[PDB]
Nucleic acid binder design. Structure first.
Length: 224
RNA sequence: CAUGGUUGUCGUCAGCUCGUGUCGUGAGAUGUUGGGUUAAGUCCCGCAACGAGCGCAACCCUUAAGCUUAGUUGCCAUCA
């Protein structure tokens, strides 16, 4: 669980935004404010970095899945790696509009990634012309562009770890409607009434993301 | 102007929607808009939509170069 401040504030984590762009409900987590920036109150992280953690560890261990979502350039990588390295899912490109709520339809396009990779592992690109084949090989990269790291999810993920719950808000609307409790990294500048286990931290420094998202895949590795 | 069948027309114009999801108190919207391009809702990219049907194109004829199979009634190079 627990993290040590010194790596926390060496990681970036305590920064924030301009004093103009700020949300009055993250006023409990601020600390001071230097040079137009707000500055976060790590000691409220460090109680909440873990309080997220040993919710993660509990949930991996009863069979849960845990969708990682993050898409802002900082996140797309450090979520694809660490979501892998514990065996969960993730989504890096467009959050396709409507995959949890409209799931029944977006599945069928997650099982047409597999009607196709069974046509080329057998023969059959010979029987079909070049004007019916040049198609089936970039309808394989659209459907893999977006749905790639999710193609082994059959039911709604139990929890969900979101990285920017303002760029991401398309998703949170969907989870908060299916009741899928969210864990997420709020910057300043964002709003915690929609989320369940907020992590008051930074949001732009790549290392700030990966460090924190380092953990939450540790703590599904271990309670497991 | 009680019908069924057949037929012009706008017009070969690029349209006309549906499931499921979301938005809206509702009628409705979205998708179908947007940056581009195309004869073409034709294609890419983006995007609360994700896909699908009828159209569009192509599969059909007849035209413009050849190549094997064939030589009457067609053709007449090399000969009377």
């Amino acid at each position: 669980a627990v993290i040590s401040m010194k790596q926390l504030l060496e990681a970036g984590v305590h920064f924030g935004h301009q004093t103009r762009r700020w949300n009055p409900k993250m006023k409990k987590y601020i600390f001071t404010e230097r040079n137009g920036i707000y500055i976060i109150d790590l000691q409220k992280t460090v109680k909440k970095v873990d309080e997220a953690y040993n919710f993660l560890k509990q949930v991996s261990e009863d069979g849960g899945q845990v969708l990682f979502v993050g898409t802002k350039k900082q996140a797309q990588e450090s979520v694809k790696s660490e979501a892998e390295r514990a065996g969960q899912f993730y989504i890096n490109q467009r959050w396709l509009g409507g995959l949890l709520t409209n799931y029944k339809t977006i599945s069928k396009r997650i099982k047409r990634i597999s009607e196709i990779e069974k046509m080329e592992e057998d023969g059959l690109f010979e029987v079909l012309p070049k004007k019916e084949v040049v198609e089936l090989k970039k309808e394989y990269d659209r459907l893999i562009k977006f749905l790639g790291g999710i193609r082994d999810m059959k039911s709604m993920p139990q929890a969900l770890f979101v990285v920017d719950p303002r760029k991401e808000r398309n998703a949170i609307a969907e989870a908060r409607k299916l009741n899928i409790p969210i864990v997420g990294i709020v910057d300043t500048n964002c709003d915690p009434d929609e989320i369940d286990y907020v992590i008051p931290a930074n949001d732009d420094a790549i290392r700030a993301v990966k460090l924190l998202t380092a953990k939450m895949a540790d703590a599904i590795l271990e309670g497991q």
